[PDB]
PDB file of C-alpha atoms and ligand atoms in Angstrom:
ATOM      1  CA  UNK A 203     -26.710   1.224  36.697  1.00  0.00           C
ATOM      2  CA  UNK A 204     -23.813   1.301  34.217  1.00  0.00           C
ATOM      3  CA  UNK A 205     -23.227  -2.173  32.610  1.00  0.00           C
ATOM      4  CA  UNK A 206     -20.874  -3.775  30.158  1.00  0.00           C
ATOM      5  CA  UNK A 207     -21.123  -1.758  26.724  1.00  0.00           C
ATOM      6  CA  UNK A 208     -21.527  -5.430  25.024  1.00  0.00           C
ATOM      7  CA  UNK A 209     -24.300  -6.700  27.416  1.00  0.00           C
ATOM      8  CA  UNK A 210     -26.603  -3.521  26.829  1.00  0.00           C
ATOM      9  CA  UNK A 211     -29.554  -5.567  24.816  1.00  0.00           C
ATOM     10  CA  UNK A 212     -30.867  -4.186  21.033  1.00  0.00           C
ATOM     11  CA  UNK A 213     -34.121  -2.803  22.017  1.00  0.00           C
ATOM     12  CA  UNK A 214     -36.326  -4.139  19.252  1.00  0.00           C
ATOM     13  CA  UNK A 215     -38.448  -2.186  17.402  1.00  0.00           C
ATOM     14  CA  UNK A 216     -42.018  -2.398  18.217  1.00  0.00           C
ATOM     15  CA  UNK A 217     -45.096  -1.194  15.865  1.00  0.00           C
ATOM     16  CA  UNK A 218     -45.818   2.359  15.832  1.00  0.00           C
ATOM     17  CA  UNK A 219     -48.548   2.835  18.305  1.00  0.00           C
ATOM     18  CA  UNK A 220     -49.412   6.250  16.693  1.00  0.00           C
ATOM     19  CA  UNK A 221     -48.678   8.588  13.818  1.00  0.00           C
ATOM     20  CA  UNK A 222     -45.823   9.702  15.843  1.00  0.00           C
ATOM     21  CA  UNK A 223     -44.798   6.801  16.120  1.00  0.00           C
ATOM     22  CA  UNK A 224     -45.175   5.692  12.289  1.00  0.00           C
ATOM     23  CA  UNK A 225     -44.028   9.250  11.075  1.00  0.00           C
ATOM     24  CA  UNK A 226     -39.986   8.527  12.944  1.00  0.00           C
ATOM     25  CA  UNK A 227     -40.385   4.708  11.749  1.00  0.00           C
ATOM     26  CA  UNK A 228     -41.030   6.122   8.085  1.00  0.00           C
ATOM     27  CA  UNK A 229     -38.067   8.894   7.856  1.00  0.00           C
ATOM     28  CA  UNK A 230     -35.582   6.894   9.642  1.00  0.00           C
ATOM     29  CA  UNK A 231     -32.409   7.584   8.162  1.00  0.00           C
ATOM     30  CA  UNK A 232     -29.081   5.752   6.560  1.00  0.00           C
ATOM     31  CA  UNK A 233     -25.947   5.731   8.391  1.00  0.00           C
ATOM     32  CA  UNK A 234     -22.209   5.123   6.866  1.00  0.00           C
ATOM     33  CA  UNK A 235     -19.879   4.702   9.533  1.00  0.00           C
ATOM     34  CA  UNK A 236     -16.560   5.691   7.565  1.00  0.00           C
ATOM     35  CA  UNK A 237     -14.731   4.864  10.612  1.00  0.00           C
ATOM     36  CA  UNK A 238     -14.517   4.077  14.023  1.00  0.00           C
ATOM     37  CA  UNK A 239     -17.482   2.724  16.312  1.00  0.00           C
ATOM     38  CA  UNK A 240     -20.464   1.105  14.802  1.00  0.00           C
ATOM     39  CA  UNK A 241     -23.612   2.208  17.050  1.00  0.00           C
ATOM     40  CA  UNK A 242     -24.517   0.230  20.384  1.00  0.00           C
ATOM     41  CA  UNK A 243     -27.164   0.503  22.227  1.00  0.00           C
ATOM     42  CA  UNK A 244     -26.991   2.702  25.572  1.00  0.00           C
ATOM     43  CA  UNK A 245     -29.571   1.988  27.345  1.00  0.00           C
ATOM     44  CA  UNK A 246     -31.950  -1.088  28.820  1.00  0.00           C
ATOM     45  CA  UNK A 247     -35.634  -0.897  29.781  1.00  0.00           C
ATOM     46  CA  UNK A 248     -34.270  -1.036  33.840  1.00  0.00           C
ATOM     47  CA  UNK A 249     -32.524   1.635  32.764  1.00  0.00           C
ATOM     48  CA  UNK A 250     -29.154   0.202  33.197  1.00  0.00           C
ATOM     49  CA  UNK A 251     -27.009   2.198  30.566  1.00  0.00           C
ATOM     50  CA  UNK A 252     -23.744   1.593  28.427  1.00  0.00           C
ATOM     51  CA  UNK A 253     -20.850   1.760  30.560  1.00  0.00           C
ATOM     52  CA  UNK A 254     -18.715   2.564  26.641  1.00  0.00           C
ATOM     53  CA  UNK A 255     -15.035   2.208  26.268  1.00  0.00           C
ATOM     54  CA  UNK A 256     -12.079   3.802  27.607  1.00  0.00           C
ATOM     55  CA  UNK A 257     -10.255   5.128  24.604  1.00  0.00           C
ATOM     56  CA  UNK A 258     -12.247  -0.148  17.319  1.00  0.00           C
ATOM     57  CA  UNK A 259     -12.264  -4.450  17.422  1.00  0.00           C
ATOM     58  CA  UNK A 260     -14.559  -3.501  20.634  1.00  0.00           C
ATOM     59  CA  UNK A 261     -17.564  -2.142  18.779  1.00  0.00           C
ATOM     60  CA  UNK A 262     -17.615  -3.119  15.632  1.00  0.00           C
ATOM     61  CA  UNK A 263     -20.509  -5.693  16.371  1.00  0.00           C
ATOM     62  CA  UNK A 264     -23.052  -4.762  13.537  1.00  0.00           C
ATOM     63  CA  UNK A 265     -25.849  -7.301  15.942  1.00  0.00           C
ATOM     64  CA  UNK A 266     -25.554  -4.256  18.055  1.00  0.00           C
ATOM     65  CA  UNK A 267     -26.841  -1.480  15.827  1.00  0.00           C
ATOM     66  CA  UNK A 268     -29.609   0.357  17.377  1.00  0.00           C
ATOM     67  CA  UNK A 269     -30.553   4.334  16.528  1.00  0.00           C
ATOM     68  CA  UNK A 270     -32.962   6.510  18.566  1.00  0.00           C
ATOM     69  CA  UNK A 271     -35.099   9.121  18.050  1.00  0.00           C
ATOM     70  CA  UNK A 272     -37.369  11.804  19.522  1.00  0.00           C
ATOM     71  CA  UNK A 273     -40.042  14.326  17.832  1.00  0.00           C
ATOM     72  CA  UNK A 274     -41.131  17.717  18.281  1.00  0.00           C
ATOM     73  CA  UNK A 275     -42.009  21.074  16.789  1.00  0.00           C
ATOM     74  CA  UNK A 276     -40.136  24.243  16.681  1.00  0.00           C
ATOM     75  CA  UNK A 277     -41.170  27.663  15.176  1.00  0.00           C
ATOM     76  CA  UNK A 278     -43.868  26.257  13.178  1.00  0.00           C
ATOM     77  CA  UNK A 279     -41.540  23.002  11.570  1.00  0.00           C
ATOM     78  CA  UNK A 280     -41.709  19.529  12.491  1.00  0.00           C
ATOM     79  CA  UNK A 281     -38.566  17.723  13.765  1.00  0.00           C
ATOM     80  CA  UNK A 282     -37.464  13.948  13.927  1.00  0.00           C
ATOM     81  CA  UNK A 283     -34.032  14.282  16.165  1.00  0.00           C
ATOM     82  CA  UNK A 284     -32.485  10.352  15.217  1.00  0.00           C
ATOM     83  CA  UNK A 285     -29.550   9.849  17.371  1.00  0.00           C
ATOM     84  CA  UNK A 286     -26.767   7.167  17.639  1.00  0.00           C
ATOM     85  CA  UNK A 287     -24.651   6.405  21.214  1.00  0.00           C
ATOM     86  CA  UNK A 288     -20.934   4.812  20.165  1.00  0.00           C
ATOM     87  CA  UNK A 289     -18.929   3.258  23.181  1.00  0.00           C
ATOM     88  CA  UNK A 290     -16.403   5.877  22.198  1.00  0.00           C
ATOM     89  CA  UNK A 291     -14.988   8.640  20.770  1.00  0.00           C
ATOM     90  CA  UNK A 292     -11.169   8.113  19.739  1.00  0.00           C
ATOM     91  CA  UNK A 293      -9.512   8.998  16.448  1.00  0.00           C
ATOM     92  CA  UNK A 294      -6.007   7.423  17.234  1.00  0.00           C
ATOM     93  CA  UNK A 295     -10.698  10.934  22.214  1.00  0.00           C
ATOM     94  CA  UNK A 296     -13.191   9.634  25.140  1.00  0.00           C
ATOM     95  CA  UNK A 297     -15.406   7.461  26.566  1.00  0.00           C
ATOM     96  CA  UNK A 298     -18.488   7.210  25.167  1.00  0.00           C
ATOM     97  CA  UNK A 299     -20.144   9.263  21.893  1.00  0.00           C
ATOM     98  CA  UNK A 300     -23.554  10.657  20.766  1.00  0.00           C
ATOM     99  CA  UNK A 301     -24.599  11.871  17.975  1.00  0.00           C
ATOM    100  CA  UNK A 302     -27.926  13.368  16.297  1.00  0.00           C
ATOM    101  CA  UNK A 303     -29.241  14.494  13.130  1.00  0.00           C
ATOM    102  CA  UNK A 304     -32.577  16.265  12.841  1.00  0.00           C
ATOM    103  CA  UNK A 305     -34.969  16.025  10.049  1.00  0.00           C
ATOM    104  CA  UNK A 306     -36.758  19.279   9.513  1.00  0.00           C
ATOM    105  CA  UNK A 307     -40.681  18.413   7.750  1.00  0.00           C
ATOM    106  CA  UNK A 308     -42.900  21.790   6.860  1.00  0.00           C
ATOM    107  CA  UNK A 309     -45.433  19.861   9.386  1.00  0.00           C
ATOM    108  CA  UNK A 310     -46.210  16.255  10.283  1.00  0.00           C
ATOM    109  CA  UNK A 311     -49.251  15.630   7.213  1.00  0.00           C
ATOM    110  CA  UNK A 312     -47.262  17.052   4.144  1.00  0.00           C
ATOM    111  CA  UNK A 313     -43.657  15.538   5.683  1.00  0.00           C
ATOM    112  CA  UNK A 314     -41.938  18.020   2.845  1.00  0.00           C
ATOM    113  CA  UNK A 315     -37.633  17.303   3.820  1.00  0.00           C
ATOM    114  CA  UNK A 316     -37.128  21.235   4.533  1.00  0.00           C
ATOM    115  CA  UNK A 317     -33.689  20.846   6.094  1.00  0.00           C
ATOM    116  CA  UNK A 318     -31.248  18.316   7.789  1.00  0.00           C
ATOM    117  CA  UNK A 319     -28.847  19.152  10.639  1.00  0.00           C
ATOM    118  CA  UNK A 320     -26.157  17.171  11.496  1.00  0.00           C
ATOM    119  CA  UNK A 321     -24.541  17.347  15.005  1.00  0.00           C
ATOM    120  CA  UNK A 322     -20.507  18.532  14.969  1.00  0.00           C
ATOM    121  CA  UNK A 323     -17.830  19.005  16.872  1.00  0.00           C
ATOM    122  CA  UNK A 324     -22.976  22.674  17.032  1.00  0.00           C
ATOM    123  CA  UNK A 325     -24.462  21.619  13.642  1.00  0.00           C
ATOM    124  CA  UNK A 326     -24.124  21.251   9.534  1.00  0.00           C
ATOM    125  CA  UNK A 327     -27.258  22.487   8.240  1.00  0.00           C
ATOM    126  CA  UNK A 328     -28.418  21.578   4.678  1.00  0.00           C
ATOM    127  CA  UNK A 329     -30.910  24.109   4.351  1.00  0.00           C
ATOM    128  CA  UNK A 330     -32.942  23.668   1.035  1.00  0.00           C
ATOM    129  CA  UNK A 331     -32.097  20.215   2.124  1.00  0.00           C
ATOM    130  CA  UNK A 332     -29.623  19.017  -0.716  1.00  0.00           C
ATOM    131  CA  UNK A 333     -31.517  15.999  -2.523  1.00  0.00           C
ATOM    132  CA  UNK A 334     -28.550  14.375  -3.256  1.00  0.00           C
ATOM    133  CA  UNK A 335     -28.575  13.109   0.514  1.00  0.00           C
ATOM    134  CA  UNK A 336     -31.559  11.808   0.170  1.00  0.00           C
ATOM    135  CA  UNK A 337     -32.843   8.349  -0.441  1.00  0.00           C
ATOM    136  CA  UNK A 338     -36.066   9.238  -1.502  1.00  0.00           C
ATOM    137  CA  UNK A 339     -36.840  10.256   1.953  1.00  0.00           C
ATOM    138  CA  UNK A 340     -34.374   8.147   3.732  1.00  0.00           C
ATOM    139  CA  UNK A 341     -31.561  10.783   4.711  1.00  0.00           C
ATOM    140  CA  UNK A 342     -27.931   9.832   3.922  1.00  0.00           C
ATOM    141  CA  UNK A 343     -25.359  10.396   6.928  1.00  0.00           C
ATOM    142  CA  UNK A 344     -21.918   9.942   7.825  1.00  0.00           C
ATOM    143  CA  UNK A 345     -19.983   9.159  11.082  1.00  0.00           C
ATOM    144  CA  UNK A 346     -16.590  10.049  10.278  1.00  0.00           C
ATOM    145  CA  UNK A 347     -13.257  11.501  12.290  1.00  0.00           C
ATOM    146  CA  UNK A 348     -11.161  13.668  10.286  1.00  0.00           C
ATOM    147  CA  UNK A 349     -13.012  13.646  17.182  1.00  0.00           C
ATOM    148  CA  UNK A 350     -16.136  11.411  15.339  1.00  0.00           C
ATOM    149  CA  UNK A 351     -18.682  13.672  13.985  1.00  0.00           C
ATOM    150  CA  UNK A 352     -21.997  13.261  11.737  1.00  0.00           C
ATOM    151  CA  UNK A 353     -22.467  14.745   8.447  1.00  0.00           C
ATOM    152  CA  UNK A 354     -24.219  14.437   5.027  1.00  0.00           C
ATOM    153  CA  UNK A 355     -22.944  11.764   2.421  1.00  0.00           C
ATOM    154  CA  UNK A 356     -24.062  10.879  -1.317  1.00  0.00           C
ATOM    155  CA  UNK A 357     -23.361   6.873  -0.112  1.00  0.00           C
ATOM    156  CA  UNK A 358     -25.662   4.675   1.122  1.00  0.00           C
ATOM    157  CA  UNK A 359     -25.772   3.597   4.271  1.00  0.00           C
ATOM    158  CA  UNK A 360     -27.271   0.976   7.119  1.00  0.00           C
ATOM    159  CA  UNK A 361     -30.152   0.868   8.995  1.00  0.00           C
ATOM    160  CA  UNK A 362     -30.827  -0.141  12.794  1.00  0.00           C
ATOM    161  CA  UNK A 363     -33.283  -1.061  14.998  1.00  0.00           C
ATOM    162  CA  UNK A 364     -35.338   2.204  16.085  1.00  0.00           C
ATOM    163  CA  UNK A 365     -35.956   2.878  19.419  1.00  0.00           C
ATOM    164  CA  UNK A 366     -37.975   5.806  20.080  1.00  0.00           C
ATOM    165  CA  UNK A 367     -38.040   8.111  23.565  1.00  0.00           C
ATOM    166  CA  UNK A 368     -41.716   8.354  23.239  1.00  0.00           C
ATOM    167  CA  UNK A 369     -42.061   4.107  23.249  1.00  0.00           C
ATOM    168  CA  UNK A 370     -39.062   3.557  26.196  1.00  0.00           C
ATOM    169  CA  UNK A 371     -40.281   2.515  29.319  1.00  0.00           C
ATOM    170  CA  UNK A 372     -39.758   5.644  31.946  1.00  0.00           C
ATOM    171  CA  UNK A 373     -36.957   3.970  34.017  1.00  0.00           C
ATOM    172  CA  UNK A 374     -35.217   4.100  30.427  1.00  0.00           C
ATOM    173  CA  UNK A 375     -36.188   8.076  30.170  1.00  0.00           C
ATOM    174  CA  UNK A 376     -34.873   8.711  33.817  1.00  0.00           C
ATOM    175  CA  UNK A 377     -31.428   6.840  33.327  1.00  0.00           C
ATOM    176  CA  UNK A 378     -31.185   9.041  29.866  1.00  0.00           C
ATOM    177  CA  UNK A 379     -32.061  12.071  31.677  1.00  0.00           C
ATOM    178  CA  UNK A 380     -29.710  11.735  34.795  1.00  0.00           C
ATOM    179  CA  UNK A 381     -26.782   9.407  33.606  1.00  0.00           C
ATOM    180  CA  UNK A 382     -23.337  11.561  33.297  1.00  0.00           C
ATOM    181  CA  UNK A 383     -22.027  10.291  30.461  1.00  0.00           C
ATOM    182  CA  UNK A 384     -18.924  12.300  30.236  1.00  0.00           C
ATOM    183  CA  UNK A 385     -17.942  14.039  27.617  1.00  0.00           C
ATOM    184  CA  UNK A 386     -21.077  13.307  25.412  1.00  0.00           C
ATOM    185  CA  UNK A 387     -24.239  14.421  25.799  1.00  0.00           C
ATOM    186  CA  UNK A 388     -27.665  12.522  25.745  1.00  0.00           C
ATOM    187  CA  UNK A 389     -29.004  15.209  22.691  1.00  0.00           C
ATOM    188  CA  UNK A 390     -32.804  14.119  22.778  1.00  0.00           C
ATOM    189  CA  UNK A 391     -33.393  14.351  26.859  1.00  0.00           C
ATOM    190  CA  UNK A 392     -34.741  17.625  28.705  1.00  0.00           C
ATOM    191  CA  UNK A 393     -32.718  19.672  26.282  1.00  0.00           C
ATOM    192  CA  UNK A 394     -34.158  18.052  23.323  1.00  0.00           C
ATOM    193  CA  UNK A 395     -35.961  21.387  22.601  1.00  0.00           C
ATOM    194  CA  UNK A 396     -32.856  23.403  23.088  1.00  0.00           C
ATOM    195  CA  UNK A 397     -31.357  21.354  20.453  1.00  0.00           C
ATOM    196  CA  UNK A 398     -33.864  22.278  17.972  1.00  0.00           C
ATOM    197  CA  UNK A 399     -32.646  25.650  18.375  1.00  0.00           C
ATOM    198  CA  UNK A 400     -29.114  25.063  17.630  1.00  0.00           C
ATOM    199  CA  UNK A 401     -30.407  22.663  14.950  1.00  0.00           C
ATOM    200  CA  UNK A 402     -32.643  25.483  13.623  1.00  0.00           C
ATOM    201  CA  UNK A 403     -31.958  26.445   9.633  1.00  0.00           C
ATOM    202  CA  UNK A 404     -33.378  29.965   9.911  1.00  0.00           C
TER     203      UNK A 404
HETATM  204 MG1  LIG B 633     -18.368  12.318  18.160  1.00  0.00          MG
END
């Protein structure tokens, strides 16, 4: 069920069982949080999820920094979806935030940075991706309100804890899948693939 936003546990990062696996752990990106929430965790292996805040001294707990991510292919690319959950949304908003970037590879072997997307307000594509956001191959995001959105950023940035769908338990998966969280939406669940769409760079 829904439990105290603070009380959620950091899932830790476990090995990469497979090349999946090792591929997300390798291209995970950098996030600057300009301003308001750092990222929390939002869900538990019971699959108890974030209950967030009712709309920053109430997540700004960096111990709490997880990111998540998903992969898949679309129209002949390879994407890494990361995604961050923030209790909430509120420039001065709502309960509860998520957030996603995709990295775009021409295919899993060669892991070429083709494109980024960056969710908003549908997406900011950077399409050659623009190698001044990258870190080698670490991309460089932003969480910023100018309602709290993602974009791409020439600063460096922090790293969390990577939790991947494909290495969550299933009670995890189901709580992701089913749990209304409001006004944000879960971006890496059974619409992860119409995502990539939206994310698409043409
Ligand atoms: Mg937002």
């Amino acid at each position: 069920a829904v439990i105290n936003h603070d009380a959620v546990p950091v899932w830790p990062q476990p090995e990469p069982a497979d090349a999946t696996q090792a591929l997300a752990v390798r291209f995970k990106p950098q996030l600057d949080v300009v301003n308001g929430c750092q990222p929390y965790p939002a869900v538990d292996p019971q699959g108890n999820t974030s209950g967030g805040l009712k709309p920053a001294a109430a997540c700004r707990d960096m111990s709490k920094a997880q990111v998540y991510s998903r992969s898949g292919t679309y129209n002949g690319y390879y994407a890494i979806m990361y995604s961050w959950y923030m209790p909430k949304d509120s420039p001065s908003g709502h309960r509860h935030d998520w957030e996603n970037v995709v990295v775009w590879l021409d295919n899993a072997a060669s892991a070429n940075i083709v494109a980024l997307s960056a969710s908003a307000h549908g997406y900011k594509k950077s399409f050659p991706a623009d190698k001044s956001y990258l870190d080698g191959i670490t991309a460089k995001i932003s969480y910023k309100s100018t309602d709290h959105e993602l974009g791409f950023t020439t600063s460096a940035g922090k790293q969390q804890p990577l939790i991947q769908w494909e290495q969550m338990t299933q009670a995890a998966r189901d709580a992701l899948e089913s749990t209304d969280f409001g006004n944000a939406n879960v971006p890496f669940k059974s619409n992860f693939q119409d995502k990539l769409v939206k994310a698409f760079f043409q």
